[PDB]
Amino acid sequence: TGDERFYAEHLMPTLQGLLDPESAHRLAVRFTSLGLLPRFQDSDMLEVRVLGHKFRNPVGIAAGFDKHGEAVDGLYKMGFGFVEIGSVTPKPQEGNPRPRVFRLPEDQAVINRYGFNSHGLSVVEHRLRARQQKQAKLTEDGLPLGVNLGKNKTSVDAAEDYAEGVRVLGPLADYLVVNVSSPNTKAELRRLLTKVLQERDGLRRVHRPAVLVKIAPDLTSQDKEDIASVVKELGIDGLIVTNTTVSRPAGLQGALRSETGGLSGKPLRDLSTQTIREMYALTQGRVPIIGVGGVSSGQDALEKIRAGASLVQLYTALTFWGPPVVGKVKRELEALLKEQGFGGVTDAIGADHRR
Numbered sequence: 001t002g003d004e005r006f007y008a009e010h011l012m013p014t015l016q017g018l019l020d021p022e023s024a025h026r027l028a029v030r031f032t033s034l035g036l037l038p039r040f041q042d043s044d045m046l047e048v049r050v051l052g053h054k055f056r057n058p059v060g061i062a063a064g065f066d067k068h069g070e071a072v073d074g075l076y077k078m079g080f081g082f083v084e085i086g087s088v089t090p091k092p093q094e095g096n097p098r099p100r101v102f103r104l105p106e107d108q109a110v111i112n113r114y115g116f117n118s119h120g121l122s123v124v125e126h127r128l129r130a131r132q133q134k135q136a137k138l139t140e141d142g143l144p145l146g147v148n149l150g151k152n153k154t155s156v157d158a159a160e161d162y163a164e165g166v167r168v169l170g171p172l173a174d175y176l177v178v179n180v181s182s183p184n185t186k187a188e189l190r191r192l193l194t195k196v197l198q199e200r201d202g203l204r205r206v207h208r209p210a211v212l213v214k215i216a217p218d219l220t221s222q223d224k225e226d227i228a229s230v231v232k233e234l235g236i237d238g239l240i241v242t243n244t245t246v247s248r249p250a251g252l253q254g255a256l257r258s259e260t261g262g263l264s265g266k267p268l269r270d271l272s273t274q275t276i277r278e279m280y281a282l283t284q285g286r287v288p289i290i291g292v293g294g295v296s297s298g299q300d301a302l303e304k305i306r307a308g309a310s311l312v313q314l315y316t317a318l319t320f321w322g323p324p325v326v327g328k329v330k331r332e333l334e335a336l337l338k339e340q341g342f343g344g345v346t347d348a349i350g351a352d353h354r355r
């Protein structure tokens with residue numbers, strides 16, 4: 001380990017006693033944008049090709065860490081195979097009043113109710129424009145960029161909010177995420193998606209992103225049936241499974257366990273894996289899934305891959321372990337793939353459903 005141990009057992013715990021969660025978040029974004037990051041060689045086993053793109057490795061940074069697109073380059077430096085920014089809202093909005101981010105150290109969990117604090121499409125548009133061609137080279141080198149699209153608190157036409165997002169940031173993105181799963185803000189989902197896809201199809205070819213839908217882990221069985229049906233009917237390019245949970249699993253110990261918000265981290269892990277498993281089966285393994293929820297090790301990552309994920313993301317784990325957790329997850333995942341007889345990540349995708 002080395003750096004891993006220093007960060008996990010000394011640094012992060014020190015920073016956590018000195019800074020509230022949102023200050024820590026804000027300072028992490030600044031340092032990451034500045035390249036102030038701890039100083040793992042990518043191997044051919046971790047490469048994934050999906051959503052029409054090469055991913056040097058399958059470990060991405062989930063939405064919500066870089067909501068405004070300020071640290072994209074620093075996140076590739078940290079070793080993420082792909083970066084997702086957002087959620088971005090059409091117009092700028094401040095989000096919920098503070099405090100709105102809460103630490104549950106005894107559960108390796110976080111509760112957040114940011115409320116889609118966003119700089120807005122226009123600010124984020126120019127931020128991405130200033131590095132558009134640098135990003136084109138990154139994408140070509142297997143380091144793609146995703147943009148997560150939200151809706152303003154006050155909007156009166158949710159589908160037009162997403163359509164404006166497709167129009168404004170779609171041309172700068174490798175894939176788009178239609179986030180219909182924040183807990184902080186069937187033919188009707190079909191209405192929404194039909195309209196996002198038509199707007200996406202209306203973009204010039206070199207500027208035409210894949211479109212993914214991100215779902216909650218709190219869906220009824222009927223909701224998952226209806227989502228799987230529409231996704232396959234409309235040709236949605238993939239799913240992100242899952243957002244945070246508004247449930248509170250039995251056994252939470254943190255004093256702030258009853259704060260309103262979505263719960264992330266280790267108590268969400270297997271709820272998210274089970275939702276990946278179900279969605280993979282309802283879509284017959286034909287719809288790429290990015291698996292997200294409580295990933296902090298190679299075993300966490302592989303369990304979601306085996307359940308049906310082509311790619312994984314993490315966020316809360318970064319808040320406890322720091323940047324070295326990216327190399328840790330990737331090192332452990334490679335070793336586990338060899339240990340279980342998988343030629344590479346690709347071979348492991350959905351492996352549980354074939355056993």
Ligand SMILES: Cc1cc2nc3c(=O)[nH]c(=O)nc-3n(C[C@H](O)[C@H](O)[C@H](O)COP(=O)(O)O)c2cc1C
Binds near residue numbers: 112293
């Ligand atoms: C503080 C915080 C903010 C988040 N903001 C967003 C967001 O704006 N949009 C989004 O789709 N997901 C958001 N998420 C969800 C993450 O992208 C991810 O789905 C979730 O936290 C599970 O992964 P994790 O357990 O590894 O963190 C947020 C999560 C956290 C903890």
Ligand SMILES: CC(=O)Nc1ccc(C#Cc2cccc(N)c2)cc1
Binds near residue numbers: 025027029038065101
């Ligand atoms: C809620 C939340 O976002 N929490 C959080 C996220 C990230 C960090 C960090 C960090 C870090 C550590 C070393 C170098 C650099 N650039 C950044 C801390 C807290």
Ligand SMILES: O=C(O)c1cc(=O)[nH]c(=O)[nH]1
Binds near residue numbers: 064112113114182
């Ligand atoms: O901005 C938020 O509060 C937020 C959005 C989202 O999609 N997920 C989450 O946990 N929080």
Ligand SMILES: [Cl-]
Binds near residue numbers: 266267
């Ligand atoms: Cl648990």
